[PDB]
Design an enzyme around this catalytic site. Structure first.
Site: not given
Ligand SMILES: Nc1nc2c(ncn2[C@@H]2O[C@H](COP(=O)(O)OP(=O)(O)OP(=O)(O)O)[C@@H](O)[C@H]2O)c(=O)[nH]1
Ligand SMILES: [Mg+2]
Ligand SMILES: Nc1nc2c(ncn2[C@@H]2O[C@H](COP(=O)(O)OP(=O)(O)OP(=O)(O)O)[C@@H](O)[C@H]2O)c(=O)[nH]1
Ligand SMILES: [Ca+2]
Ligand SMILES: [Mg+2]
Lengths: 421, 57, 440
Positions: C11-12, C99, C143-144, C146, C179, C254
């Site tokens: 997501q992030a 995840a 995230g899982g 990520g 989250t 560089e």
């Molecule tokens: N800066 C920023 N952080 C985010 C965003 N979406 C989620 N996060 C952060 O990302 C973390 C949660 O991981 P996500 O990336 O949402 O989860 P994922 O990688 O999709 O993994 P799963 O959902 O468990 O499969 C937390 O620290 C959130 O605050 C975004 O759009 N911007």
């Molecule tokens: Mg997710």
């Protein structure tokens, strides 16, 4: 992960199940026939979690209505949303159980169990992505107590990688004076510790105490108690039912809330039974807990807070920080950032602003010890065992159920006494 | 030597990864095997409960 | 050539990708349909923007990028959103089950079912390239997917592409928007397993960005939409060297030469200026000296640490807009005398400077003011180890009681992996300590 499969077993299970479906159908804008009549797009966005889409844009609950006693089939079908359920999902037995766990679990319920498993498999096969199961039942009865726990163990065999959620209703002498309910609860607890991922402890003693002392009713019916349970069940499923980041599915909630596999018994809460700081103090107060336990007699491993209504999120953040600072000793230091908070726009019917509380406190031992004291009062003189030993059970199995619930309390105590350094 | 070390890194990354992914599948399957075996032990217990009702009548 | 393939995981990553690509399109005059009127050479070209965009014969300019996520909902909004015509369907990859904030499910269980498809789809982009430079991986630590899937991907990319460069943009977690209670575990796990396979990683501290949106933009409770727009400006300042032509433009590789003294010490601190609201920017032109001075104010950093209580191994200033070398040099001289910039004895103290003439752009209906000039400082400071320390402490508190460990073990992981990962971070903290000690 979207589709959850609902199961309701026994009198308690079906009646709290009925109220659950009445409230969420109203929130999602579904009428007794099953048509969409609302306005907001957010009502339909995650409708598929609890509703199947039949022909003619009909929305049908993914519910499986179960009982050994007929007659409960009539009450659900005659009730306000009786028409909306799927007629084939009714799976009802013959002679009932009569508040006997061994009838529900081993003998009479074991015969009806495969005909229910057919309905589950049929509903589960059609799920685009099944996330898991939520049972509603009491642990003080016979069917919901014993057959509901057999169903849990049986569904686990065919779906070991799905989430098993329960809304287990704990018995209390103040609400029901059936003498063998402490035997039924303890036997069910022995199954729940092993075979569920998360159990909401909806305690009738707390529901009685709230109805009497807060809601002002001198002697409350089963209808009064259910007004609180349906409000709670609506609240804890708000993350699952509307768009949101936190605890959005059954495994993400489980991962955040359950730090140890056995310790998955949550203390529910709701407010009001108003401003943001008042809500926040009310939900953390013992008087709003749907389990009859004082949080100040232990510590929170984890907490989930769900706010509903139009309100300043800045004010919610400041307030949740306020109570964590002020009540710091009542949250285990060795799990950082263990209190999480979601905010949903849509408030429930009637209230403009509400707050729902799920907490995994070590103080939940007060509920298990209470059942443990009522259990050992009967078992140490071998009272009423002929109901159970007649149906085929041994004393050994009764002793293991006592020992497992004593271990559970010992483990809650261990982590309550745990410190960082 | 540049080729030798670049190849070594690719080689050992591939072997380290394959060892972990096979070790993980062993562990996950063994965890699920133990869960079902405990659940199948309940069916054998429930069969003795139903036999000790009929063999007591 | 010198192509660059951006991979957005979770997501992030995905939502930061939306921000970045929307912003890159506005910077290069590319339309939502993909067309670029100012580009006269149809079907292809060797221009600077072609490092990030391929061209179809129909004149469509297509992001050299892959979006991966283990569930459909976030990528669905790219498929149906404003820029749906910009990406081929095969660039947007989704599974069904996420995840669940678990590194194990991302790396092993759910992740292994989609990894071969992802690598296959990255290969279609790689075979479009005449001289591939490397990859930019956008993901969260917490995230899982990520954490877990990213690590898995980086291991596989080292196999399939050797030592070809791999940069990270890693979102470091913060309690205001996090989250999940298990983010420390995921963060340490992925940091450990990625470390050998990454050449340079720009950490973004969500709290740091959150505070900046509160303090500088006066947003009462910043959303991901608010944070991502700011992040994309920093990301754009770092990638502007690749995407634009320029006489005084210095390539990112560089800067990397100066930023990475040893392979493991590859985490530069990002600091950006000016972040200012339209109301405050009106009749308020910020000079080169003002924005340069803002780089050494720690409130403007992408990561919460204090450089003033650590030591410098490198300082780089990436300018864009109305900037000339004279002004930059004047500003640096002023800073050198007035501020706490202590270098280690084994590095040279000279600041490294790059200037892109294309001025900074703002996404319409945004919070940032449009400014004539802007700067991103990339520094290599021992102070960034503070971010590791804070996160490593959260890990230890939970891991000492094995809190939540069963969720990872249930999906096939061993306790050995946790402690192995923690000892690598212990070593990494020891490494940042060691580099700051004087020579003998
Ligand atoms: N800066 C920023 N952080 C985010 C965003 N979406 C989620 N996060 C952060 O990302 C973390 C949660 O991981 P996500 O990336 O949402 O989860 P994922 O990688 O999709 O993994 P799963 O959902 O468990 O499969 C937390 O620290 C959130 O605050 C975004 O759009 N911007
Ligand atoms: Mg997710
Ligand atoms: N909160 C609440 N509790 C209920 C309700 N109905 C029954 N109970 C409780 O449930 C317990 C008894 O279990 P039942 O559900 O009646 O029993 P059953 O599972 O239908 O099993 P059999 O009666 O043996 O068929 C008692 O402690 C009651 O207080 C209800 O509508 N709400
Ligand atoms: Ca061209
Ligand atoms: Mg009954």
């Amino acid at each position: 992960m979207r589709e959850i499969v609902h199961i309701q077993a026994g009198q308690c299970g079906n009646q709290i199940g009925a109220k659950f479906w009445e409230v969420i159908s109203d929130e999602h804008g579904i009428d007794p026939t099953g048509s969409y009549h609302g306005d907001s797009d957010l009502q339909l966005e995650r409708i598929n979690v609890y509703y199947n889409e039949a022909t003619g844009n009909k929305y049908v609950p993914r519910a499986i209505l179960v009982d050994l006693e007929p007659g409960t089939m009539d009450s659900v079908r005659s009730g306000p949303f009786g028409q909306i359920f799927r007629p084939d999902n009714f799976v009802f037995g013959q002679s009932g159980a009569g508040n006997n766990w061994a009838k529900g679990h081993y003998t009479e319920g074991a015969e009806l169990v495969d005909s229910v498993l057919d309905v589950v498999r049929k509903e589960s096969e059609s799920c685009d992505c099944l996330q898991g199961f939520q049972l509603t039942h009491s642990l003080g009865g016979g069917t919901g107590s014993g057959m509901g726990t057999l169903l849990i163990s049986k569904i686990r065999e065919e779906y070991p990688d799905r989430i098993m959620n329960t809304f287990s209703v704990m018995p209390s002498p103040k609400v029901s004076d059936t003498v063998v309910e402490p035997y039924n609860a303890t036997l069910s607890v022995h199954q729940l510790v092993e075979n569920t991922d998360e159990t909401y402890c909806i305690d009738n003693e707390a529901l009685y105490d709230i109805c009497f002392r807060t809601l002002k009713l001198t002697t409350p019916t089963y209808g009064d108690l259910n007004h609180l349970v349906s409000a709670t069940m609506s609240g804890v499923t708000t993350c699952l039912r509307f768009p949101g980041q936190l605890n959005a599915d059954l495994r993400k909630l489980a991962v955040n809330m359950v730090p140890f596999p056995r310790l998955h018994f949550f203390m529910p809460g709701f407010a009001p039974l108003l401003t943001v700081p008042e809500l926040t103090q009310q939900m953390f107060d013992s008087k709003n807990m749907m389990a009859a336990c004082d949080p100040r007699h232990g510590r929170y491993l984890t907490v989930a807070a769900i706010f509903r209504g139009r309100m300043s999120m800045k004010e919610v953040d400041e307030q949740m920080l306020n109570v964590q600072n002020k009540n710091s000793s009542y949250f285990v230091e060795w799990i950082p950032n263990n209190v999480k908070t979601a905010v949903c726009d849509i408030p429930p019917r009637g209230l403009k602003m509400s707050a729902t509380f799920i907490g995994n406190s070590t103080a939940i031992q007060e509920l298990f010890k209470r059942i443990s004291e009522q259990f050992t009062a009967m078992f140490r003189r071998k009272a009423f065992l002929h109901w159970y030993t007649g149906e085929g059970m041994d004393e050994m199995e009764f002793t293991e159920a006592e020992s497992n619930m004593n271990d559970l309390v010992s483990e809650y105590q261990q982590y309550q006494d745990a410190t960082a350094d | 030597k540049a080729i030798e070390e670049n190849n070594n890194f690719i080689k050992m990354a591939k072997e380290k990864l394959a060892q972990k992914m096979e070790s993980n599948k062993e562990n996950r399957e063994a965890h699920l095997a133990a869960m079902l075996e405990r659940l199948q032990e309940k069916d054998k217990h429930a069969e003795e409960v139903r036999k000790n009702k009929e063999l007591k009548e | 050539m010198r192509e660059c393939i951006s991979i957005h995981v979770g997501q992030a990553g995905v939502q930061i990708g939306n921000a970045c690509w929307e912003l890159y399109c506005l910077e290069h005059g590319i339309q939502p349909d993909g067309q670029m009127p100012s580009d006269k050479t149809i079907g292809g070209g060797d221009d600077s923007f072609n490092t990030f965009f391929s061209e179809t014969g129909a004149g469509k300019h297509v992001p050299r990028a892959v979006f991966v996520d283990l569930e459909p909902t976030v990528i669905d909004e790219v498929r149906t959103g404003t820029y749906r015509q910009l990406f081929h369907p095969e660039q947007l990859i989704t599974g069904k089950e996420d995840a669940a904030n678990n590194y194990a499910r991302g790396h092993y269980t759910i992740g292994k079912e989609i990894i071969d498809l992802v690598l296959d789809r990255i290969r279609k982009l790689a075979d479009q390239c005449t001289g591939l430079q490397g990859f930019l991986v956008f993901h969260s630590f917490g995230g899982g997917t990520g954490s877990g899937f990213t690590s898995l991907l980086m291991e596989r990319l080292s196999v399939d592409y050797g030592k070809k460069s791999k940069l990270e943009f890693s979102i470091y977690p913060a309690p205001q928007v996090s989250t999940a209670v298990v983010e420390p575990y995921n963060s340490i796990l992925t940091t450990h397993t990625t470390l050998e396979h990454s050449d340079c990683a720009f950490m973004v501290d969500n709290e740091a960005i959150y505070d900046i949106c509160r303090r500088n933009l006066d947003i009462e409770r910043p959303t991901y939409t608010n944070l991502n727009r700011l992040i994309s400006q920093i990301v754009s300042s770092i990638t502007a060297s690749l995407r634009f032509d320029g006489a005084l433009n210095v390539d990112l590789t560089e800067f990397q030469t100066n930023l990475v003294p040893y392979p493991r010490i590859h985490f530069p601190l990002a600091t950006y200026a000016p972040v200012i609201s339209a109301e405050k920017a009106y009749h308020e032109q910020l000079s080169v000296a003002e924005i340069t001075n803002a780089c050494f104010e720690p409130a403007n950093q992408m990561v919460k640490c204090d450089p003033r209580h650590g030591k410098y191994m490198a300082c780089c200033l990436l300018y864009r807009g109305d900037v000339v070398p004279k002004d930059v040099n004047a500003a640096i001289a002023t800073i050198k005398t007035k501020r706490s910039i202590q270098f280690v004895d084994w590095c040279p103290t000279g600041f490294k400077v790059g200037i892109n003439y294309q001025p900074p752009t703002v996404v319409p209906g945004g919070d940032l003011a449009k400014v004539q000039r802007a700067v991103c400082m990339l520094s290599n400071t021992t102070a960034i180890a503070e971010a590791w320390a804070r996160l490593d402490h959260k890990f230890d508190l939970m891991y000492a009681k094995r809190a939540f460990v069963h969720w990872y073990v249930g999906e096939g992981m061993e306790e050995g992996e946790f402690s192995e990962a923690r000892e690598d971070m212990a070593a990494l903290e020891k490494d940042y300590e060691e580099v700051g000690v004087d020579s003998v």
